[PDB]
Design a protein around this ligand. Structure first.
Ligand code: CU
Length: 124
């Protein structure tokens, strides 16, 4: 199945968001990051992908389709808006095995709050 994640200047959760900011998918699902508002991209947060997963980094304003396979949690960011909170989490499968690695990482406050909220939304 394919899911869109919109890259927004503002959304349901306020300024500079991925919407949704949390999404649970199955292996083989795709997530298409939509540049609905200009100036955004999506990138995995280094240290926040599961064992053996490929990192990814899109271009600014690129419509970017990712196929998620390895189970676990994937922390994502928008590079230009990372520190002020434009982050999210894609979870592949149940009981993500890399959860503690993701939780333990340091981030700027606004990014951390949004990562933590996404992890909690996903039942972690
Ligand atoms: Cu952005």
């Amino acid at each position: 199945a394919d899911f869109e994640v919109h890259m927004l200047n503002k959304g349901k959760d306020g300024a500079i968001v991925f919407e949704p900011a949390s999404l649970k998918v199955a292996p083989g699902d795709t997530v298409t990051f939509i540049p609905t508002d200009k100036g955004h991209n999506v990138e995995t947060i280094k240290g926040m992908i599961p064992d053996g997963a490929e990192a990814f980094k899109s271009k600014i304003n690129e419509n970017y389709k990712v196929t998620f396979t390895a189970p676990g949690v994937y922390g994502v960011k928008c590079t230009p808006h990372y520190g002020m909170g434009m982050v999210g989490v894609v979870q592949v499968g149940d009981a993500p095995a890399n959860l503690e690695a993701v939780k333990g990482a340091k981030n700027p406050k606004k990014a951390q709050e949004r990562l933590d909220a996404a992890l909690a939304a996903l039942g972690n």
